[PDB]
Amino acid sequence: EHYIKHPLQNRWALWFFKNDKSKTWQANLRLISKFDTVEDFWALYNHIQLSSNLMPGCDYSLFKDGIEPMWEDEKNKRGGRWLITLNKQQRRSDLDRFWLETLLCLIGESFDDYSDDVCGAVVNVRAKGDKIAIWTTECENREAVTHIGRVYKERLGLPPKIVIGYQSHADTATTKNRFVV
Amino acid sequence: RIIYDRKFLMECRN
Ligand SMILES: C[n+]1cn([C@@H]2O[C@H](COP(=O)(O)OP(=O)(O)OP(=O)(O)O)[C@@H](O)[C@H]2O)c2cc(N)[nH]c(=O)c21
């Protein structure tokens, strides 16, 4: 305890996406690093670019080790995402703050029992508008999905005027909201 | 079940 790192409930992997139209979507997805302690998280976060600084067309994804940050994964294919859409003003005011909060919600296991329903999260840096999402494992788990949206919204400090939607990945890959908070 | 407070995790950043 004067010398032991603070362990996380999960080992997490940080992924980076840079668009290269000559490659398949999946091939553009590169593992940055894995970590399983609070100290090791900050070490990685402190040395990497803020999302607000990435070239447009890039993502970060943070996923539980063993879960690939893509629809296709077993843990993702029946799942969906809580989506925060940001406008261009929010890149400045909210993107990096919201992304770090989302990271801390994941590594700290902030959704009680339903943190096991969390797969990971992704930040899309886009010229038309940035997005942050939390991916959950099963769009049919009404109580899980719904408790996660609620706590997450509180964590981001979004006002009651803002409404966020949950979309299944089935729909996204073929988008309507299954739930809002 | 290992849970961490936002305030605890922030205190660790340096
Ligand atoms: C999360 N995702 C994105 N994509 C590809 O990326 C395209 C762009 O998706 P995405 O990065 O999530 O969002 P964007 O703002 O860039 O584009 P959009 O207009 O589709 O919302 C999408 O249509 C797919 O062709 C994927 C392709 C896959 N085979 N598996 C994915 O999980 C996956």
Q: CATH no. for residue A17?
A: 3.30.760.10
A107 interfaces chain B, CB cutoff of 8 Å: yes
Which technique?
Answer: X-ray
Q: How many alpha carbons lie under 13 Å from residue A47 in its C-beta half-sphere?
A: 9
Q: What is the resolution of this structure in A?
A: 2.3
Ligand 1 atom having least distance to the Cα of A71: 32
For A138, the 3-state DSSP assignment is coil
For A22-164, where are the E strands, in sequence order?
Answer: 29-37, 58-64, 80-85, 118-124, 131-136
Edge-first strand listing for the sheet containing A131-136: A29-37, A7-18, A58-64, A118-124, A131-136, A80-85, A165-168, A179-180
Decide if A104 and B6 are in contact by the 8 Å CB cutoff. Answer: yes
Residue A43 CA from chain centroid, whole number: 19
Pairwise CA distance, residues A38 & A86, whole Å: 28
Pairwise CA distance, residues A11 & A34, whole Å: 7
Distance to chain A for B2, nearest Cα, Å: 5
Six token digits for residue A32: 């940055």
Domain residues for A39? Answer: 1-181
Count how many domains chain A has: 1
Task: Please report, as a single letter, which amino acid is at residue A34.
Answer: K
